A paper describes a structure:
Micrographs of purified P74-26 virions revealed flexible tails with a stacked ring pattern. Our final reconstruction has a global resolution of 2.72-Å, according to the gold standard 0.143 Fourier Shell Correlation criteria. This resolution allowed us to clearly observe every residue in the TTP from the N-terminus to the C-terminus. Using this reconstruction, we built an atomic model of the gp93 TTP de novo in its entirety, which we were able to trace unambiguously. The diameters of the outer and inner surface of the tube are ∼90 Å and ∼45 Å, respectively, consistent with other known tail tubes. The P74-26 tail tube, however, has a markedly smooth outer surface with no additional domains or protrusions. There is density that runs through the center of the tube, which presumably corresponds to the tail’s TMP, gp95.
The hyperthermophilic phage P74-26 is particularly intriguing as it has the longest tail of any known virus (nearly 1 μm) and is the most thermostable known phage. We find that the P74-26 TTP forms rings that are trimeric rather than hexameric and assembles using an abundance of hydrophobic and electrostatic interactions. Each P74-26 TTP subunit consists of two β-sandwich domains: an N-terminal domain (domain 1) and a C-terminal domain (domain 2), connected by a linker.
Numbering used by the authors:
A (entry chain D), B (entry chain E), C (entry chain C), D (entry chain A), E (entry chain B): 1 to 348
Write the structure that this text describes.
Amino acid sequence: MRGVDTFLAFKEQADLKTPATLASLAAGDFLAFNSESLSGRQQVIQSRAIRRMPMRQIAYTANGTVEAGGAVEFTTSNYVLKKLLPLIFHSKTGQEDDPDGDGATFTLVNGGVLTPFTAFVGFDGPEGKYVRRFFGAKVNQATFSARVNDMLNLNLDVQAIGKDILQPGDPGWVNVTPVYPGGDEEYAYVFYQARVLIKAGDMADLAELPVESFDLTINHNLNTNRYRLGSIYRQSLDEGVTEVTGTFTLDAAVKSISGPALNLTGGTAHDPAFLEKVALYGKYAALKLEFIDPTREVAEGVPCRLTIHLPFVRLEEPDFQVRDPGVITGSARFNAYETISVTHVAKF
Amino acid sequence: MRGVDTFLAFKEQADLKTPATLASLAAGDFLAFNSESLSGRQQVIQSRAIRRMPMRQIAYTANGTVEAGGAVEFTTSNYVLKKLLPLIFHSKTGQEDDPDGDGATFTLVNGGVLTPFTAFVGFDGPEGKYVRRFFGAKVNQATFSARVNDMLNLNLDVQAIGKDILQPGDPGWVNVTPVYPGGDEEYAYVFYQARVLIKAGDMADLAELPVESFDLTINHNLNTNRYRLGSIYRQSLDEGVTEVTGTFTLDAAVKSISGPALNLTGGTAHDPAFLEKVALYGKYAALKLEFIDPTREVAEGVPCRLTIHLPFVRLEEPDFQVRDPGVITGSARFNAYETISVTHVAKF
Amino acid sequence: MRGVDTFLAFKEQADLKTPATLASLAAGDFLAFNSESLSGRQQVIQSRAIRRMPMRQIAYTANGTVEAGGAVEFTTSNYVLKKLLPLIFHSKTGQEDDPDGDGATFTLVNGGVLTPFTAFVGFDGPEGKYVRRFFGAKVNQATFSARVNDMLNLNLDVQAIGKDILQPGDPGWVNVTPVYPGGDEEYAYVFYQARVLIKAGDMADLAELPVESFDLTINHNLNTNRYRLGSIYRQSLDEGVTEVTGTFTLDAAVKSISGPALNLTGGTAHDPAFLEKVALYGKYAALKLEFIDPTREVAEGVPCRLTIHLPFVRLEEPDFQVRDPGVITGSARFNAYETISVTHVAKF
Amino acid sequence: MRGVDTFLAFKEQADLKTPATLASLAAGDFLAFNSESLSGRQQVIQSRAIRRMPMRQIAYTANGTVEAGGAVEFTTSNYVLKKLLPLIFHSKTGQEDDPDGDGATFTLVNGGVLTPFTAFVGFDGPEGKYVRRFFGAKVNQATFSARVNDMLNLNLDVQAIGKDILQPGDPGWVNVTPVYPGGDEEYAYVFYQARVLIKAGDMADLAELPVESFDLTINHNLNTNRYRLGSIYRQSLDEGVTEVTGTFTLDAAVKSISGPALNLTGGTAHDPAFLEKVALYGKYAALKLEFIDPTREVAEGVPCRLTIHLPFVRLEEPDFQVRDPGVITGSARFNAYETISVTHVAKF
Amino acid sequence: MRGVDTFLAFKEQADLKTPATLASLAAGDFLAFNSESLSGRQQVIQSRAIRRMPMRQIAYTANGTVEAGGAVEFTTSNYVLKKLLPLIFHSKTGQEDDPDGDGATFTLVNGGVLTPFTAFVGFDGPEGKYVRRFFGAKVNQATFSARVNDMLNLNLDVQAIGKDILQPGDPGWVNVTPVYPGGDEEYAYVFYQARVLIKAGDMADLAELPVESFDLTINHNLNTNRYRLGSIYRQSLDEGVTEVTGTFTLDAAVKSISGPALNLTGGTAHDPAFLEKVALYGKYAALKLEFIDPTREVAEGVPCRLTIHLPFVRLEEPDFQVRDPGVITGSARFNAYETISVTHVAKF
C-alpha cells in the first residue's frame, strides 16, 4: 500500500452514535490530506486474583474500554476549508460564495456544540480494499500554521468513539470511488498572501506586523473519559471551554509595514518596546490573520479571503532574547479571550 | 585504557551472597561484548538536624544503601548464547549439540528462579590491572534485536547486589588471562538468516512475514528495593512476573512470503487488514522468530538454529499511518502471554 | 576481452523476481550499445564485539545486502527505441509501423508501473565465454541528448535486484549467438534532423528555436532501499514520482527560425526578453523536441519521426551571462509538469 | 546579442526598497566590466497533500521567495574605483582629486552600513532593447586581485532584493544611451605598479616583499535570509561582521627588495624563516598593498595612488612545500583584524 | 631556497613528547625524498562576547590547539626502506642483510604500537639556515605504488604533535651536514622487477597476474583529537585498527602469466570470470606483491627482494566496464583482513 492508494473522507452524522454509511459518500466528502494518524486503542484488563504463573494468562485477561482518534494534517485549500470550518466552530452564517462578497462567518456561540462526523480512511491497492471507519468523531484541536515558503496548513486533532474495519463482503460495504475537485477548481493559500495585523492601546487602526511565521490553535477541550458500565465505548465527547492560543515570530522593536505606528497612545512615533509593554502591562490587543488571493475573484471586485478576527488578545513576554550579535528575533505567544471569528470568502 | 584492554566474564555462583572467585574463571566464562555499562551507586544520607552552615558538612553526612547493575550488549553468537540463555530463563532441557538435533530448550517455569552470577569487568593495560567485580547479579531484562545489515544483538539489563574492586595484592586476586573460542569455532547470526512467522484465526500453518526489523524483550521485573536495617546491600533480587513484549516493523497489507495466506479464516485469499483486525478483535496470534544457519551443521542434516516460540501473542494497533505518498510502513508491538520457549541448536 | 567481444541483451520478465532465461533471447533482444557500466555491490558487515586485533578478522565479518545496476549508453536508433521506450514509460498505444502513420505513443499513466527486465552482458572472446545476468532490472533514469555533429544518445540508469554469472556448464547456460538488425534495416537520428519548438503566453503556434544542444531526463525515483530480514536482495523497486527535467543551449534574445514570433502576447514583434520573462513570471511553456527523417518513409507520405511532447514546462532563469564581448549564449533549464508524451513513427 | 551590445550601470538609491529610475542614469553611472553574472531565482513550492499523479502538477504548485545577485568583474580603473569604493566601505573622507594629494580614504566604521544600489544590465542589439534591473543591491564581497602580466581586477559578489525586466513601452522605460569616460581620461593599474610591504616584530619600517600575485577579499557577510509572511522578497540585507582575508604568492626565505631586512628583532641580518615564524608565533604583521602610477600626476608632485592599509594581520603557515628540486614557492594566506583603510588618489 | 638546498631526516625518539636533538642526526637518518608537505596549523579562538566592531579584534582573539603533519613521498630504495619499514609496522624480526637470506620481516602484532619519531626538514641556502622540527611524529598512512615506466614509490601521511623552528643561535642548534649513501651503495626497485601473485578457491599455488599498476595502503587510523585543558598540543597519537586496502589495474578475463591457471577449483582450464566470481561469492584470496632485483645479491645466491604477503584478501567488483570496442581494462580494489607481512632482503 502507498499513501496515494488511500483516500480520506469526513461525513457529518446526525447523532454521535450512528456512523455514516460508506454508500453516502459523495463529492465534497473526500479530502486531500498531508498525513493521517487516526487509530483506535483497546484497553486490556488483567485479573487481580493472585496466581502462580511465570507470564500473563489468557484465561485471566479481559479487554476494556476503547479510544479512537489521532491527527490529520491538511493544506488549507478551498474545499478543505469549506468542509472543515463547519466542523471546528459552532455556528456558521452566510455562504462563502455569497455574491455580495462577505463570505461565511464561523464563530463559537454560548452553548454551542460541535458536529460529530465519521472519518473514512480507505485503502485500495494491489493488496486489496478496506476502509477504516472512525465513528463519532469530533475535532478536538485545530491549528492553523503559516511559514515562509510554505502553504497554510491545518492540523486537526480528532477524538472518536470507536474504530471498525469494512471490507468487501461486509454488510455495510460499498466500493467507493473518491471524487475530488478539479485542479482548476481548487485553490490554496500561500505564505505571501498572509497579513498579521495588530492593534492595542489607543492605536486608531490595525497596523501590519512583519512576522516570519504564525500558529493559531483552537482547543475545544473535549471530555474523552465518559465511560459507563455495560459499554467499552465512550458515551459522549462533551466539549469544555474553547481555549484559543497562538504564537507568531518577529523581531525585537519591529515597525509596522502598513497602518498606523505601533504606539499604545495612538501617536505617530514608533514604540520600540510595543509588544514588551503590551505583555508587561497586561493590555488586550486585537489581532487579525488574513489571507487574500487577489488573483481569484469571488464577486465583481471581491477576492478570495480567509480572515481570522481575534479581538481581545493577551500576549506573553515576547521572548526577545539577546542570543548573538545579529538581529534579535523571538516568538510572541498569545491567548485569545472573548470571541474568535473566521470569515471565508470563496468560490467553488 | 582501551576497550580492547578489558575483558568481561560472567560466572554462576551457588548462593546470591557468595561472589565467584577470580581464580575460578576458565574457558567459557569470558565473553566478547559490544559495550558494558555496569556500575555501582552509593547513597548519601544527610542529617536533618538543623544547623547554620553555608554548605554540606562532612561530620553530618552518612552514606546509605548501594545499588549495582547496568547494561551489557552482545552480538548474539554461538558461545554468547550458550553462556547467557541459561541466565535469562528458568529451565533448560537438552544440550545444544545433542546429536539428534533438537538442541536445548529454555523456558520459564511456574515457580522458577533466575541464576545469580558474578560479572567481572577486568582491565589490563599500560596503566595497570584491576577488576570490577559485581556480585549477586541477575538478568533483569534481555532484548533480542534484528536489523537489516546487522547481526542479532542481545542487550542485558543486569541488577546486582554490589560492586568491589580487585587489584594486585588483594586477598582474592589472580592474574587472569582471558581465553576465547577460536575464530573458526564461534559463529553468529546475521539478519539474512532470520524468519518471522505468524499465525492467527483459522490459519492452518505459520506464514512468513516480510519484516524489516524486530525486537523481543524479556523483563523479569526484579524487586530491587529489598533493604533492611544493618546492611547497605540489597537482601535479594526477587523476580516478579516475566513480561515478554516485542515489536516488528513491516508494511500495511503485507502478504506472506511463504506458508499460507494471511487470512483469519484459513482461506487462500489475502486479507489486507490482517494485522489491523488481529489487533482490533483482540485475537491471539502465534509468532516464531527463527534464525537458521544452513552453512553450519550440528547433526547429519540439522543446521544451527535459534528459534523463539511465542504462542499466544496480542498485537497493538499495527501503527500503519499514511505519512507520505510512499509505501505505508509501521511497527506492530505485541505482548506474549502464556509461555515463551527458546530452542538453540548449536555445535561447539 | 574486447568491447566487440561482448553483447548486451535486455529481456522483459513476467515477475520482478524471476530472471529471464538465457535460452529465451532472440532477435530484438540484443542491442548495440556505446558503453555499459552495470555492476553489483555486496555489503560487508563487521561485528561490533570489541576484540584486540591489529586488522579485520575473517571470523567476525559477515556480508549483507546487495545492490545492482549501472548506466548504459545507446545511440538512439530504430530498434533501440523500439526496445527501450516500452521500458521507460508506463503505457504504449499504437504500433510504430502503423500504416496510417501516427506511430506508437508512450506516456506515463496515473498508477502506472515500470516493466522489469533482465540485462545480459555476455562475453565471448579468446579467453572464454560468460554472461553477467542482472535480474529484476528497471529503468531508473533515461536521458535523451542531442549535440551538433553527433547522433541522438539515450543514457539509461538502471537499478536491479541482483547480479549473477553464467558460464558453460551452469544449469541455466545456453551458448547464445547475438542476432542484430541488418545495416540496411537500422536507422538512427542525427543532429540535423532535430527541431526544438516552444510556445508560451498567447503565442498562436509552436515557434522553432535555434538551440545548440538539448538534454531531457526522465527520472522515475525508484526506491532502492526496501530490504527485509531473511534476504540480502532488494524486495522491490517501487517507483516514486516521475521527475522530467531538461536543458537546452541557445543564444540570448534569439528569434524563432519558423513559426510565430517569440512574443508572450501573440504579436508579430520579437521579444528579446522572451525566455527571461517566461522564467521571471513563472509562465508555463509547451516544448516539443522532434526528430524527422524525411529520407525514410513509414507510410505513403509519412516519414520516420520521434516527437517528445512536453506541454506545461517551467524554465529557470535562462543563464544568459555577459562573459565576453562575443555572442551571449546560455543554457535554459526546465522542469516538465502535467504530462510527457513520446510518439515514435518507425518502420522495421 | 553580443557583450558589446550590453551596458552596466550602478546607481545609488535612497532606500533599500526604492529602485533607481532608468531616467536618472547619467555620466559616472555606466561602468565597463569584464563579465557580469547577476541573476534572479524564484523558489517553487510544492503542495504536500498526497495525490496520485505520475508527474508534478500545475494546480498544486506555488512559487515562493526570490533571490537576486551574482558576480561582476571589473578592471580596477580610475572611474571604476571612484564608483565602487564608496559601495564597498562604510565611510569616505576626502576627495580623490583633492589638490593637496591625500585622496579619499575609505574605511569601515563601528556601526556603519552599506549603500544600497540598483544594477542595470541593459541590452541594445539587433534583436531589440531591454534592461535587467536588480534593485536593492549591496556589495556582499569584493576581491582585489593582482597577477603578473595583468591589470588589477576587482570582483564584486552582489546580493539584491529582486530582479525585473524593463522594455520599450513599460511605465518606467527610458531609452538610455551609455556615456563613458574618454580613453584619454580613464586610467588603470598594471601589475608593475604594485608594491606589497610587510612589517612585523621590531622591524622599524615597512619592507617590500617580492610577491608574484596577491588577492584581498572583503566579505561583509550579509544576511540574505530575512523573509516574512506576505512577501516573496528579502526584507533586508543586514550586514554582519566584515571579514578581510587575503593571500599572496612568494618564494621561501625571500629577502626584502627595499626597506629594512625581514627580521622580527629589527636587526640588519635576514631571517630565512621570517614568515614561517610570524605564522608559528601568532604575531601580528602590518601589510600595505600599494599601486602608484608616476606617469599620472594628481597634484604638483603627487602621483595617482591606490593604497590598502592592513595594520594587524595574521598569517597562516606560509605553505612552503618542497615539491621539486627548484625554487620553493608558496602562498601565504592572511586575515586582517582591527581595521582596513583604502586611500585612492586620483584625478578625473 | 631550492629543493636541493633542503634535507629531510627522521630520527626515532624514546618518548612521544621528547623530540630528538639536532645533534644526534647521523648516517642513516637523512633520506632523499620526492616531496614533503609537513606543516603545522594553530587554531584561533574568537571570544563570543557580543561587541560592536566592524572587524575582528586582537584583544578578543586567542589561539588554541595545534596540529602538525603532512605527506612525504619517497622513491622506495634500499636505505629508505631500511629506515621507514620499522616506522610503518609494529614488529620486526631478522636483519635485511642476514647472510642466510630471509631478510627482515615486518608485521602488525596484536597490541603493537608505532614508533614515534622527529622529522627534520632543514634548509641551508644562500638565504641562510634553519630547520623545521616536527616532534612526536607517527606514520598515519603508508602507500606503496607501482606504475609502468616508474619506480616503486612510498607515500607517508604523518601526524605529529607540534612544529618548531630551529635557527643559528637557538639553544638546540647544530650545523648539521647531511650524509647520504653512496650512489654505488643505494638501490631502488623498478616496475619491471614487480610481480603480483594471486590465489583463491582451490588453486594449488600462487598464479602471476599481468597487472598494469598497483597500490597498497596501510592506514593506522591514529586518533588525532586527544586534547586536554592546559595544553595546546595533542596528548597522544593513539593508533586504532590498521586498515590495509589496495588496488591493482588489469584487463578483464586475464590469464595468469605463470603458476597455475586462474580457476577457483584448481583445474587447468582458465576461468574468464575469475576475479568477478571471487568478488561476487565473497571469497578470500591471497595476494603477494614481490619485487626482486637479480642483479643485486644479498647472499651466495639470494637476490634483493621486497615481498608483501597479504593472505586473506577480499576484492570488490573488479570494475570491468565495456567503455569502448577496445580491450576491457579495470581496477580491482581489495581489503586485506587477517595479517600483512613485509619481507625485505637487502644488503647495505
